[model samples]
Structures are given as C-alpha cells and as structure tokens.
Target: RIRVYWDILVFICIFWASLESPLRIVLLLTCIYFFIDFVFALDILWNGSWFIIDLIAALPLEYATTTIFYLYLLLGVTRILKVFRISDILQRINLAFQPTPGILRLVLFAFWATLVAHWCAVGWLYVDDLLDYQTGWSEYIIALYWTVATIATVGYGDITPSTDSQRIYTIFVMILGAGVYATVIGNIASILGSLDLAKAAQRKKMAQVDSFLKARNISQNIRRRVRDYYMYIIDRGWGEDENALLNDLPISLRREVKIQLHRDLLEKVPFLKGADPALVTSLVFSMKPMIFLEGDTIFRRGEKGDDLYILSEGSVDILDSDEKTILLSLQEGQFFGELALVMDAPRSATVRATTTCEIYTLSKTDFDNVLKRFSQFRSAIEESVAH
Candidate 1:
C-alpha cells in the first residue's frame, strides 16, 4: 500500500519537468528534489549499488542553464531518465509478489506506452514554442491529441507541425509511434489468445467427436448425448491434465488446492465433517470426478463397491433391488455411498442417474490410505464399528 503512495509521488516528480512552465517547475523541483537527493544516496549505500543515472538525477544542473533560457528544460533529460527507475521498481514488485501473470504484464506495457506518449505530448508544446501564451490547459489538449493520435498511426491530418524543427520532432515521434502501436496490438492479441487455449482444445475435441461419429454412421441421438455430456464436463474445466497439475505442485499447496475445491461438498459431508483436517485433505485430494450418462447405473444393489460418491452435478435416484422405481432422489451438492467407504460392506442401495452426472468418487483405497497415514482415524473407524 505504501508502494502505491510512492508511485504517485515519484510519477509526479518524473513528469513535472514537462509541466511546460518555468515558475512551476522551479518551485516544485527545488525543495523536493533537494530532500529526495540524500534519500537516493542512502539507498545507494544500503543496496550496495549505484546507478550513474541516480548520480545524475540529484543535481538540478539543468536548472543551471536556466539563466540561458529554455536550454535547462531540455537539459532535464537526465531527470526524465528516471523513467527507467519506474520499470526497475515495477518489475521488482512483480517478481517479489509472483512470477507475474501475462495479463498484468500486458497492462504494464500499455501504461508505459501511455507514459511515453504523455512525455512527448508535453515535449511538443515546449518545442512548439508558439504556445507560450500560457492558455487555460488548451495547449495540453492540443499537444496530447497530436502525439496520441500519431502514435496510434492514425494522425487524422488535423494537428500538423507548422515550424521546421517541430516537423522533424513529429517525424521522429511517428517512427517510435509505429513501433509502440505494433507492440501493443501484438501482445494484446497473443495474451488474449492464450486465455482460451483450454476452451479451444475443448472445442476441437467436440468437433473430433462429431467427425468420428459421422464416419461411424452413428445415430443422431447417441452422438448428441455424447456431445452434451462432453460439453458439460469441458465447461467445468475438467479438460485439464489433473495429475500433471497437482503432482507438480508442492505438498502443502497441492493439499490446500484440492481440499478447498470441494469446499461446498466437504463442508456438508456428514462423516467427512468430523475427520482430521490433514486426513480430510488427503481424502479429498485422492477423490476424482466421475461421469455417468443418463440411464446408467452408478452401482447396483449388493455390489462390492470401493468408492464413495458425492453428487456434484445432475441427479441420481436411489433404487431398491427391483431397480426400477425410485426410493429416494439426490441432486447437486449432495453425497451418498459413504457407508461402503467406511465399512466392509456391499452397496446397500443402487444409485442410478436419470441425467448426465458428475460424481466425486472417493476411492476405498484412498480412504484406507488416509486412515493408514493418519493414525487417529483408526480409532474413529473402530468407534464406528463399535456403534
């Protein structure tokens, strides 16, 4: 947060040379710039490093040329060189926090580009020298309008350089503008393109299913049901390589990532609620989202089942041995089949899906592993047995 305040102050100091007025620049520069000088020296000592730019930034030598007219204003070039300091500080903040996501870095490039445009805008008015009239911020609008438009490579021919020297400056600006325009457009396109990479893969897979099914001469209903099911799963981002992602993560991060993912289901999971956090973490991490299409049996009554089911999406009907009439129904955010996970028993009731379903399956092996890894759970197991 303090960094926010420092950026504002430093930003103002950096751009103030282009404030395009002598009295204002002199008044603002002397007091703050003098005090800010020693702070730089202190930082140089503490960091055990010195930048030549830092050395040059302290002296208002550009102001020494003030007696010779606006020569000092151009001499403020060394002070404007502090813009590199902006990049240095911004990058350090980025790495200190995280590796820096592409989108964030993209915006930083934009901001830097605009910063350059702004400096050139003010620089134009200074060189235009025709605008010494000290008008009411009118010059600023004209200056910014010209530079910004030129950089965008869309100079509408409205703002033209009148003088010989200003014409040369505008030409130089136009070349740099072209480069900035290309960089902004290219990075934005690439960065935005990558955000959809996973979804794009999902789309291609759907088309693959369509193409292959067409070759097989499959019926429309079967092909469509498959497409809908795949769509639902892909929409939830299950297209990712889960093992590759989780295994690559460090242990603590991996556990936290997996556990919190089931936050809604885990919070309400009955037998799971009282389990140790570490054990629960292990339990949930080993669980996988399983898919069952409509009219499919999740498990038959009296079947030796090893996995617990948490109904994440879609509906399931619990059936008696006859397997036709629904005895009970479950919907999203509900769990069933826990008894099999906890006890040495077959599934007492068959669960059948009436629609495409995603069930979070907690493998019995994972439950056993959880108990083995956390000893206190053994007591809980035996206690449930005693009851």
Candidate 2:
C-alpha cells in the first residue's frame, strides 16, 4: 500500500516545485493538470458524485490575471485536498497485503483525517483572503503553520484570526482535530495491550507445563523429554490444532489449501496423476494426516485394505509375508496402498515404518464419497490401475 504520509509529502514537493519553475512552465503544468482533472471529473460525473468544487478547482486560474482569477486560484487551492481521493486506490492495494490489526487501521485513518482537516483549514484561509499578509508559497506555508497552531491550541499570536467568523472557524477546526488526537492516544494503548497479551499467554502456558512437571516429580530423563517437547511446541508457534483450524475454514478455501500443500504427493501416485484437476482437488481435501514411530507396523500382510497412504515425510518399507524380503522402501512423495481405493482388497504385502514417518491417508469411504460427486474420477483411477 502507498503510505499516505509519503503521498502527501510527494504532493507537497510537486506543488512547491512547480512554483519555482518559469511562468510558461507553470502554466504548462497547470494546463496538463487541468485536462487530467477534467477527465477525472468526467468520471465522477458518470459515477454521480461530481461536485461543483471539482470543476471550480480544475479552472485554469494561472492563465488569467485579475481579482476574479486570483479568487479562483485561491478556490483551486482546495484542489490540494483532492489528493485525499488517492486514499481509495491506496485502500484497494492495501487489501492485497496481509490484514492489519484494528488499532493500526485506526491509526492510519486518524492520520489521514488529520491531514484532511489541515488541508481544509489552509484552503479556508486562502479562500477567505486572510493570507494576503504573505505572498506566493510563503502564504501557503504560513496558513498551514497557523492551522497547526490553532489545532494544537498553541496560538503563537503572530497570525490571529482577523474576524468573528474566522475566530469561530478556528475553534471549529480545533475541535475537529481533537477527535483525531484522541484516537491516536487510544490507538497506542490498543497496540500495546494486544501485542503484550499474546506474549503473556505464551509464557503463561509454559509456566503451567512447568508446574505440572514439578508436581508430578518426574525422573530427570522424563523431565528433560517433557521440557524439550514443550519448548519445541513453543518455538514452532503452533497457533491452533490443525484439524480444528481446517474444519473452521470454508470448504472451498480448505480444498485449495490442501491442494497446495499436497499436490506433489498426489502427482506421484500413478492413479491420480494426469487425473482431472477437479478430481485431484476433491481427493486432496479428503486426505488426513497420519504419523508412525520407527518400527511400528502400519499394516500386516492379508489385513483388510481400506486406505491408501501417501508418504509426505520419512520412509516406510514394504515386505513380503515372511517379513524378511524387502519388496520396496518408499520415501517422501511416494505412495502405497492405492488398490484400496478401487475395492476392499486385503493387503498384498506387509508395510512398516522404517523411521518416524508422516503420511496422508485417503480412506475407501472418502474415495467413494468423492466418486459420487465426480463419477469420472472413478473411471480415471480404475483405468490407471488397470494400465
């Protein structure tokens, strides 16, 4: 997102820089800007938010000389406030980035609001002709300085409001800016509270685990293991249980995330590879994670085959019924038990974990459930298995 601060700074630079250029150059820039503003106004008209102020601000005031053009130029100073419209485009870009906390969002809104208030005050002074005391860019700077003083309630008295209406407007401006100041203070407190509470909760959880271990009076080896696992969970920063988190998400979003995480695993399976994308997507979401410790028996020879397993991490060994013949050792991204998807066939060979292993399982029930929605997937899988 474009920083609103930087946006205003760039506009300030451009506004002042044009003043330093020769008259024709200034007029040329003014003409170019006028046309651009006209096109922008045309768009606003189509959208039905068009205002007279937009057309008034776009007038070529620099091209004419007289009290009328001078007043129009002062009116055009309000055009500086039009830059606030950039906030709309900036907001759209902001949506593409990670979401911000409510407090930070409030702070941003306050900052923009303050800028807008300052713009209005300075433009008001120029239109009121109270800035005749200063000339050129100096007039703009002096007006803004006076506005800051008024908003801050620090009237330096060097530029006092000359009339009752000006005095009344000054009071109104100060009150308007007060809300922005109040929000800024509240925003700071909110950020500290939100961030500190998160860290406090993490430490609180660790303390509870420590208390439990102490009360149990476990052996040194057990204590060390428990502490190590607790620290691992903390350092890894698991926010919520995966099953709960996935279940909470929309089905479409969950499917997309699952596909992204497990697509390579699915592609390695001959039956799933080259399948319709929709079929693969359906199968991906149906997969559930499984873990096995070293030497654990995943399935015994002749056991009922009900699930296909895809190894995403570690390795598993396939052995003949005697358990001495190594038929295959499947590594990460490889798969086994695919025959389970087509029919309830018994295991053809024993499979066991060679080391700690992580696999994703697609059960027969889920496969059938998916086939009911995507009938072509069954034909594709059967043909692939036959081939």
Candidate 3:
C-alpha cells in the first residue's frame, strides 16, 4: 500500500496557508496532525471530546519520541505533488480514474520540458551565464530547435546550458526525450478524425468557409446548415491542461490568503477606521500582497492608476509632482490611491516608500470579482469610496 500518511501533511500545509481565525486555523492544523498519528498508531478513527481537547493541547507544539524527520523528508515534495493529485481527483470525483494515465503522462512530460527549458534559458540569459538568440525567428523554429536539441541529446555549444537549471534540464532531456521520438513513431493515433466523420461535411465546409471559403456562393440552405455544424463542433469543450491549471491552486487556498491580507491591512490603517468593515472585507478579498524596497515609488502623480493600496507594514513619503519634494509622510495604516479608485483619474500625489513596505493592493479586476459575486459588499464599498 502507498503510505498515505502524507495526505495529512498536505492538509496541514493547506490549513497553514488558509485565512481562518488564528485559533481555529491552529486547532484544525493540530487536529489533522494528531488524527494522523492516532488513527495510524492506535487504530482509532476518532475518539470524541477527549480527542478534541488533546488535539488542541498538542496544537502549538508536538513532542514525539519517534524521530519522524526522515519520514517527513520522504513525504516533503511528494505532499505538494499529492495536492495536485487531490485537485485532479476532485475534478472527476465520480470517475474511475480521477486523472487518466495519458493526461498525467502529458503533465509529467510538459513539467519536465518546462523546467529544463527554463533552467537552460535562464542560466544562459543570466548575467553570469552564456546564452545567445537571434533578433527574430518565425513561430516554430525556436520550438523545433529545442525539440531537436532535446531529442538528439546534444547540448550543442550554440545554445549551451548557462545555469545549473539548464544543466539539470539537459540531463532530463537526455534521459527521457532521446527515446521518446522513437516511441512516438510506429504507433497509431486514436482515430478521432474517423470517429468525427458523422459530421464531416459540416466540418469540411467550415474549414473551407475561411477567407478561402467565402469566395464560393453555395446554397443558402447548405451554407447555414454547414455553419451550424461548424459552430456545434468548434464551440464545444476541448481538452484543457486541467492539471497545470489546478496545480497552482491546491483547493480553495486563495480565500485564506485573501483573508490574511484583509486583516493585516485593516489592523494597520487608522484612516481605514473611518472606512466600512464590509468594504474593507471586500477590499481584503480583492487585495493582493505586494512588496517594495526603499526608494520605490508606490504611485506617481498624473500616472494612470487602477489599484488602491493599504500599507500593511511600511512607510511612504508623499511627494509632489517634482518627486524630490516631500509633501507629507504617509506611514502604515494610511491609504493612498483612494482618489484613483473614486475618480478613475491619474494619481494625485507621488507616494514613494521611505523603507521596505508590504502592501495589500486591490485592482479593478479584484473589485469586479467582489462586486459581481458579493453585491451587498460592493454597495457598502461604493458608499465608502464616495465618503
């Protein structure tokens, strides 16, 4: 049996990255940790109220006599991969195979290819490493080059691996890609074309109905029929990289991250005290974390602005259009970009951080998501922005 205890590790990570009430989050994380050991070692699925109390006590710190470092290490990266597995499983919960073998293989191959290419390109492009590319090339040449290079297992001097990453990529390409081409050959593709023939005439006419297709005047009846057929086939769902899409988001993780950002922003900003809590909540959900070092301009006067920000931890010096001239010290808890939010106008002042600042930003896209999905919150914010 696959040692399934790593699922608990992943659940803990997910809980950590969530934005539940601190005590609740800690309790949940602790419960998962204890539940794992209890169920496995003692053969107990759950033990009731005592279990709850014990889990809470063990929440902040755990002292296990057993050295589980090696166990944890073995499960470390695998747990992250398992989260993607959970996402894959969740997608097709009722299906026999959560993610089909073919799709998983494609994901693994694509992941390897991306890591290799990125490492190689970054290494060569890095100031310290070597990489060279021409000014211009058509769409497929660069792709063909990488494919050919990868397939042949030749790290040619021309596109030499510049970084350790490139070197790692070269190894993966050499090991896997060399034989993949041969494996691909002398194999048959699933005859989707043959299967799709029931509607072939419709498909064919649509293909022809391009600029090349528009030249002919066939029966209006036939054309409309063909057009409908084309729309039916073309406007349907197709294979998506669902694995790639869900891998970044390990289930409902965005909500917690958003909440943490919201609390941090509201707690630090005093002017926001005048702001509505519900609006701030909307802002929190809409907001994203941003970082800036000393001497960075948060916003400049007369520049197009769309994001309103709350400085979570940092200070910005409000400047006049001259940029060098200080107008006021805008510290943490003081909001900027409200003018931009309210008026959709260029920034009214230059706000440059005096020191490193962790800011939470709310963009137009964020506002739209909140407004469309949570209109009551939107109404409250529209009122606050007016104020």
Candidate 4:
C-alpha cells in the first residue's frame, strides 16, 4: 500500500539541486524530473487510480500527504530564506567563523550562542547525573566550564562525563559545537559572498532599468529623464543598493561594473599596481578618455600645455616641431605632454593622434584640485615618476 513516490523523490533531488550554480543545470534537471514524474503519474492513473476525483487529486492534490508536500513546504521556506539574502544574514553568519587579531563580529555572536547551547546541554547532563550521583554545585560549575571549552573545541578534559547517558549527551554537545563551529566558519567566509551578492544586485538593477527603458512608445527626452533619474536614485545613490544597474539599462549596455573594470585591467597597469580603490574611483570619476581621429593634433609643444595624458588604448605621434614632419610612435601607456603638469611650463613636444585611439587625460586644474584633497597622492605620483 506504500506508494514509491518517485515524484516526491525527484522533487527532493530538484530542491537540493536548486542550491547549485549555473542554474541552467537546475532547470534542466527540473525538466527531466518533471517529465519522469508525469510519466509516473500517468502510470498510476493507468494502473488503478483513474477515478474522476482521483484524477483531480492525483497530481495537483499530491500536496495532501506525500513527501512532496513537505518538500514543497521546505522549498517555500527556502524561497523565504532568499529575503534574508538581501539582509545578508547568511553572509554574516558565514563571517562568524573568520579568525582575526581579536574576536570577529561573527565569532562573538557565534560564541555567545554556543555558550548558551552548551550551558543547556551541560545542565541536562548534570541533572541526569545528580539524580543518582548526587552531584554538588562545584560539579555543575565545572560542567558548565567544560561545556564552554568543549564547544569551542578547546577540549579541557577536567570534568569527564562518566555514565553512558552523560557521555551520549556530551557527544550531542560536541555535535552541537561542531555545527556552530561550521556556521561560524561559514560566516567568516561570508565576506566572499558579498561580491556575488553585488553582482546579483547589479543584474537585478540592470533588468529593472532595461524594462523601464525599453518601452517602445516613450520619447527620447522622457527616456533621458528616466535614465537620469535612475542614475541619480539608483546608480549614484546606490538605490539599487548592491544590485547591478544593467537591469535598468538597454540591452546593448547591460555589461556590469565587474566585467568592465576587470582584474586584468587592474593588473595590466604596472604604475597602477597597489593603487587604492578610493583613488581609482576618484580617478575614474575625475578623468575621462577621449579619442581623436587621424591627423588631429592633441596639443603642440610650447603651447602652454596643462594636462597629463595616459594613453589607455591607442597610438599617437610625438612630434618635435610644429611642421608635423618629424614624428615618433607614442605607444600605449606612453604618456606625453605631461611636463606641463609637472613643471608648469609649456608643452615640450607636439602630440597628435596618429590613429583612432583612446587617451585618458588629467588636466592641471583637475590635478591641483585633487592634490589638495589627497596630498599623499601627489607624493606617491612624485615617487613613482622618480622611479
């Protein structure tokens, strides 16, 4: 009379698989599992339960008693758990285990919880023993102390549990400790999840933005207003609040920040190595790269130059004279026309874009303003240039 419940079993597997990455696999497994479950349902009907009420209750009513209902309930709970992700509770829980010079935030929380749990476990063990052994107050105090130490994996073997019941209870305490330990460990590692959460937020934002942007009937000006509003509220204010902005952007511009400012880009700039992220962010905000068409002169020597150029992704011609005849190749990262920002003199050479190229420029005005804000950066740059 026991139903095999492959449908429920498949549901369980699918639910477990939902925790995995590359969600496509989860979807694929879901499809295959459903296909198999449907086949089982058909077989069940074909065999005996073909009554009209049975037909109604068979698949849809499977929620009545079988493991499917429990799995569904569990899945529902798991879905609710997704809300906690926004709160980053799980990430915080994961961080609870990270080792630090002092007690980490998560470690303290976990330690307190562990202490309470162990206290309860020890009280249980002591109560059971006191009934027969007539244990004293000191024994209970020592037991509490031992519980704390053991749960911390400190393993001070001072007050040993003698009876099998006490020993079994101690094992249970150890198990509890191990679980908390893992939670603390997970919490410590949770900081790593912040990045993934950031990416997820970014995607969510981009999707929301794109949806708003893609209404075919909106005017360009309206679209611009909407985009600006989103940038101000979402991107500038982080209204996306750890979400991506692309969900709010058009399909062509859905690239996330992580993709655009990749680790390779950071690693490629030798001079930018060990750069502070705040400085990089300030630089990114203050600096803008412009491309010039072939035969366009960027600046001329002795023309009172006032900018430093970082050749991001293009080649230009460095000329000694205004005649524009004698030239040399200005390779990527090869900065020219920056002596002005250094010496406050006219440009030492005439630089022109030889091909279509990108160049990030920092004007003297910007440098001076930023230097005022970050005086150390001036020293860092001076030291760098000296090297």
Better of 2 and 3 by lDDT: 2
> What is the per-residue lDDT of model 3 for residues 20-96, given as tens digits with 9 covering 90 to 100?
22112105754665554443233223226444533433332232433333333333222223223445333333254
Worst 10 residues of 4 by lDDT: 17-26
- What TM-score does prediction 2 earn? 0.52
lDDT top scorer: 1
Model 2 Cα shift for residue 161 (angstroms): 18
- For residues 117-214, write the lDDT of model 1, one tens digit per residue: 87788678778646465544677788788888899888789988777888899889999989888887887787778878856876887888899999
What C-alpha lDDT does candidate 3 achieve relative to the native structure? 0.53
Better of 1 and 3 by TM-score: 1
Better-scoring candidate (lDDT), 3 or 4:
4
Q: Which stretches of candidate 3 lie over 4 Å from their true place?
A: 1-261, 270-280, 368-387
Evaluated at residue 3, the lDDT of candidate 3 is 27
Misplaced by over 4 Å in model 4 are 1-267, 322-328, 383-387
State candidate 1's TM-score.
0.66
TM per model? 0.66, 0.52, 0.31, 0.35
Which one is best on TM-score? 1
